[PDB]
Amino acid sequence: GRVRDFVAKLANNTHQHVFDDLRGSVSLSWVGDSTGVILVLTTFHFGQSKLYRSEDYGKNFKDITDLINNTFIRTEFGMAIGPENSGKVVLTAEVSGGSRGGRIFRSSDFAKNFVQTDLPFHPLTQMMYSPQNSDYLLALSTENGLWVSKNFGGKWEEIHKAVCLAKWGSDNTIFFTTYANGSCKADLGALELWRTSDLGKSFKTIGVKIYSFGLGGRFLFASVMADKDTTRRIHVSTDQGDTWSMAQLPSVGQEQFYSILAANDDMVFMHVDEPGDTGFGTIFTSDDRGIVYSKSLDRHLYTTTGGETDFTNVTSLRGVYITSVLSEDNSIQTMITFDQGGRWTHLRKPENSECDATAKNKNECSLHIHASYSISQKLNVPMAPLSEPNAVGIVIAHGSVGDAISVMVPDVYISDDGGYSWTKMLEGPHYYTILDSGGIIVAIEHSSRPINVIKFSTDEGQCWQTYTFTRDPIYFTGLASEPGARSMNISIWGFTESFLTSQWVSYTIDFKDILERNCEEKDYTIWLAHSTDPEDYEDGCILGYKEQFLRLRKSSVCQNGRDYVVTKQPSICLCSLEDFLCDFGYYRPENDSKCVEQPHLTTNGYRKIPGDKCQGGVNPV
Template sequence: VLATLHYDPLVHIFNDLSGSVSLAWVGVGTGVILALTTFQVPIFMITIGQSKLYRSEDYGKSFEDVTNLINNTFIRSDFGIAIGPENSGKVILTADVSGNQGSRIFVSEDFGKSFTHQQLPFVPYMQITYNPENSNVLMALSNKVNFGTNWKKLHDMVCLVKWGRKNTMFFTANHNGSCVDRGMLELKRTTDYGKSFKTIANKIFSFGLGGKFLFASVMTGKGTFRMIHVSVDQGDTWNMAQLPPVGHEQFYSILAANDEMVFMHVDEPGDTGFGTIYVSDDRGTVYSKSLERHLYTTTGGETDFINVTSLRGVFTTSILAEDKSVQSVISFDQGGEWVPLRKPADSKCDATAKDPERCSLHIHAAYSIATGLNVPMLPLTEPNAVGLILAHGSVGDAISVLRPDVYVSDDGGYTWIKALEGPHHYAILDSGGLLIAVEQNPHRGINQIKFSTDEGQCWGVYNFTDDPVIFTGLASEPGARSMNVSLWGYRTSLFHQYWISFTIDFKDLITRNCSDQDYVQWLAHSDDISDPTDGCILGYKEKFLRLKKDSVCLNGRDFEVNTQPTPCLCTLDDFLCDFGYYRKENSSECVEQPDLKGKVLEFCLHGTEEELQTNGYRKIPGDKCEGGKIPDRKEINLRQRCVSDLLGPELLVIIIVMLLSTAAGVMFVKKYVCGGRFLVHRYSVLQQHVEDSAAGDGMDDQLETNHTPNGKIEFHDDSDEDMLE
């Protein structure tokens, strides 16, 4: 039951004029937040600035100024706040020591209660990263080094380095002295922190990790084309992926990967802005065409590909149509079939639609943000908020440039409702039991927050202040289990400007804990209850217990998703089109590619030539169907040798240190400062998971990066990038 709405939020005023605020949650369920404010001005070749550090133990309701713990040192905001894994309570702040040969870090092992400083014998080139399986071990790259203390140089002339599994490190190096010489790099591996190395591949252009797979982009022939090679044993053996080669102006991108399959984007020749998505088998070797004309810009590297984590098997992305319009599509079966998003009931095409008969919902994501549309947030889903998706969108025949609205799906993208007019910042709280939103309006102050207890159908309004604030962003604990949300902004007067945060604890508004009677059983992926296969996706049905829409109660921090899986009989929907086959639009039948008709399909696997005999279908990786219709398929060993022979700007150095070590979310609020006046206010959410540098499910892992002189990382349109969501 909703209590009185006359609850006063807790307000904290930050009396400094810093241009940016970075927020980091330290641990899970601890309530500890660190806020780092930064003001900096570049002067000639150096940067002058100041930082202040604040700490909260009550989810942002109050903050203590703890700047003295870091000796009033200027902290590099581009490196952020590095939070340790495993709820270890470890924090690293990297200081900016301009003009020095070394640098300095501040380290905490008690959730930011205290810090010790350590002089570094080098200048870091990127944020120091933790070993995801042992937070006592750190890694950094540097281009200047003077070793001492506990740091150990592992290798010279390193171009790129990544953590793997079980304390393994992979890196590329070039003994000729230049990382610009792409395609001539060596890929090396160490499992003992540099005591020994093994060269596992040569002629490397780039490499990446995803799930159990190690990928290498390798120069072939005379160096005009590249091919992807895949290893599932950390580089001991390699197989060539059955994917088209790419030229100098093209790239590969791993969109998603886990231990069972890979989504791979292969760029089209020329500056087209699109390519083709391929889906792999469980070995990462044989690929099937999943989606053509997939939008992936070469100018900025934007793609709208999103893994809908709130429902198994669901992905959304955008395609670039023949008429150059951008259109949204969704897959409910892990890339087996892509369809337009169903428009909300009673909705009409917007004014930009060319064909009112072809209306569907189109989702705004990274591409829309990059083109400058007023889209304050990407689509939002959470694994523990089953079926929920919040996104900005428009109804028409393509993505519109008009002002977007907020749409909500409660069934994983099958159906949608228009929830809010105009752009908003939004968040999911209490495992989906509570949604909150704040209007995006850069031209006037905000004093209202909207909330919904029925998955976006109805919204209440709460005035959190009488004096409107220039709103810059929402901050809620990652994981969507909290009932606290903080609204950040600033106030300004003729002579004074200052940051201010309002923290609302909705436990003071929603007072009753949920009971068994508040939940109802829900069959996922259900769209036709008369069909015996209704709800069958990837070979099984799942029933969940979900909160009733008319139940206003607390799920609680300990809420766990309850599911009941039931296997299904196999149908053609449980199969991808095999190598050399594809599905026509709106058809489940796989037909042979015209250019491969009548040809023997052979590929190299484990060093021997294999012949593929198929009716055009292969089971989707991870599909658990039983019996039913199973098309014939077999691979015949031809006993012929084939070999994936992978052995045959500034130089960086890997550095590692031993120190005495859960994923934390980092929010970043930035104000661009010019002449003492705030000109632009931008807010973005940076989900920083320490596992990002590991090979694992659902992790961001940049396959290729180019290091810029300021130490930041850029992505260029000629690179092979894997962005694992």
């Protein structure tokens, strides 16, 4: 049925901490993993800053504002936390205009001690850490210079004087662009692309007539203006610029743009905006070389170059993505693919639901999910779809049933098999979070009035129980939990006011007495992913192979632990003509998978899809 006597267990595991300060903004950062360190930066308007630190996963805080000498901190930059468990933090201060250069506070003890240094310049962007080493930092000044440091901020040196974009690469390699005359705004389309693998000792130009560049996966993209027109194309290199090749994508005008929806180690999603202010574009998918692209989804919804898109990578299950499209009648609709872009289809309606006013036929409708685009329209959608790699097949999102995204108050839906089937979880907008690799899910109401109740479920979203965690209702502001969905601590943030006495508060609840017992070998059951028809001999193998998981049973209340790794067992299907895509100068006509040439590189005509692992069968080569 359900667990009982939970109120007593949770009574002793609730801790309240009240922050005494002026209520301005709040910025929360996690330092490292498994350390439990958190930093809170309160900024307000002269201006003042307060800095708080914890070592207890947010249960207790201490005021370390005296370590930064009570200096004001630019919140626009925020905090520059180092990679991995480096325990490095950098804060940029505000200094008088007459000063020659800026000023930073830098630590390497997980914020236990800070050291003050004066830079010889005025930073224009945020410091960037090298992925390979955390002692390397670069930044651009206000005069468009490029300064690098090999000492973690101790000493800086200038390596170029007219840069306008720089980013790190693998093996401490720096790519940047420089403008010869004027400014990168005025000199756009005539830039250069340089590289230096020695941190400023030698340079090698790897591009001319550049318009922009970007890094994704193991590819390097650069947009180059045409010789005699404003149209620009794309070039891709896998050698860090030693050799280039031209991608097989249509050119764009001056008002259009490109966009890397998602890049992988063996694949990239690309968006190409159609001419005019139509508001939609197209999605292309590449091969493992990043050269040949095939049309994937038409009328993809993309607001503008700095706009919003609903594209989402469902990380719970393999090769599943969700996005929004614009229908012929100008109604926003949602699509889902399970083949990694091979095909797209509408979401399946919940088994027991009724279509809303949007639907024309009450016996025919589908689910539609609110996302970042709906948030951009000032609607009652507090969050976006949520999924974790270590929680298998669990997806939570706000949605409404109908023939298009409705403009009424949404509900919350959950899918326990990657997105094949959905069911209604809760009524009305909520804030949700996954704890302990799917062992517990918590929900908080999203209302305009004070709330003093939290709901949790151990059946993986089937039955819920309420717990009253405070006597004085607060105005909820947001939840906080350690990244990775592997902890059992949840922090609730909010403020309570009576008469000008608003004051931040937070509550931290520990579920260690609910999941008392450790999961055994008898609490896990075998599960087959991507299953559609059990009778079929080859059922459930997507992209050439199938996998079986061991998932915790919904009727077991146990703790997975922080050292949980998902069990798995791939099995390989056979190869068919559906596992290959046409290559270069070929196309695939309608109602057949054959590749026929259009009525120096040369191939047979077929190219295996990136990620396929099929063996034997039919090899059209």
